[PDB]
Amino acid sequence: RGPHDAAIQNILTELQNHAAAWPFLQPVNKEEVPDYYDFIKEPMDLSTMEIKLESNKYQKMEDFIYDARLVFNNCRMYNGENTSYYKYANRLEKFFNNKVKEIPEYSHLI
Amino acid sequence: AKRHR
Numbered sequence: 385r386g387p388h389d390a391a392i393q394n395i396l397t398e399l400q401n402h403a404a405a406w407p408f409l410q411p412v413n414k415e416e417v418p419d420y421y422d423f424i425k426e427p428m429d430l431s432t433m434e435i436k437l438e439s440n441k442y443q444k445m446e447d448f449i450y451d452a453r454l455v456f457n458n459c460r461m462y463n464g465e466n467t468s469y470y471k472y473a474n475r476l477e478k479f480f481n482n483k484v485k486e487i488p489e490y491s492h493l494i
Numbered sequence: 495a496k497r498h499r
Contacts, residue, residue, distance in 0.1 A: 464499035
């Protein structure tokens, strides 16, 4: 197994299970949010992260963290600070930061 | 609905 595969799978599973994860489980639907991709140039979501993980795309923990940050940051970039989406992003990020920081090998990345 | 800020 990849040196980070197990840690990444565990964190991703927890993210997907999280109360605040629902908006981020799949790519944003263009028919429901017609201008989304006009603004967000590096889209990301948890199903994409799962597919990347399974496709051996996360050799460096840094790449996984980058993708998690696209989910949170893209969300706060597109949505108003007073919206539920902004709140979910903040909550899921706080959770993510704690989950990674608590693994000593990756604490330097948070 | 989700919409640009």
